[PDB]
Amino acid sequence: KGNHLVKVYDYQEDGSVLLTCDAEAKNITWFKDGKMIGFLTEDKKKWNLGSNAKDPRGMYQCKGSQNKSKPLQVYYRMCQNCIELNAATISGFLFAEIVSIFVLAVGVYFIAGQD
Template identity: 50%
Template sequence: MKIPKHVIGVIILSFLFKDAVSEEPEIKLSGGKVTLYCKDAVTWFKDGKEVLYNKTDLDLGSETDDPRGMYECQDRSTKKHLQVYYRMCQSCIEFNTATISGLVIADVIATVLIAFAVYCVTSPDKGRSSQASDKQTLIRNEQLYQPLRDRDNSEYSHLSTARPRK
């Protein structure tokens, strides 16, 4: 079955005009500003209310202001819709590869320094000679028991007599 040439031409033209007719509004980001662009726009609407701005582009302001809403650009014949929900964290920190690797390296260095400090504090000193008390034997002549002191008649050297119980 052969397809007529005029049918192929109509299909090609419909694909070409499809992009031109149903072109949606675009969002442009430049210099921290959010801008909507609509080809051949005459009137802009935000959330159903007309915005007094009759150009092809609509400046939504800074991206840190979190612009959002339902925007429409309307020319004489068509109305094109675009929903904008822009969320920007104002107090966030941007992490890239260099920042993350710097944090990891700093963490490893801090851990090694703390481990070295703990080792220095807890290890015995090698340069210190043994003290005399370390070598002194408490029981001389390898006796099993240490002899008692000589008897002394001082106040605490003997047991007191027990008092009778009542």
């Protein structure tokens, strides 16, 4: 293992990730960026980070009865907020940034003429 115990389990039906601290001990202690952000009791071994849809980043580690384990930086770019900037969206942006402005201006012209 070489003092590398933290692993990530994936490839399941749902979109979730689980940190697996592969170290024999009791009352394992989870960290994040060196701080005390989480804790765990028995009857559960895989810490939950949430869904892969919310891009769980960070720098996670665990600690058993022996010395503290070694970290494992997790990066997840499951963006799902990405917009395709091809030659159709930018054209759609311009055609929606001109007609609306023109209608607003042709309304303001009449408003000012009334005033």
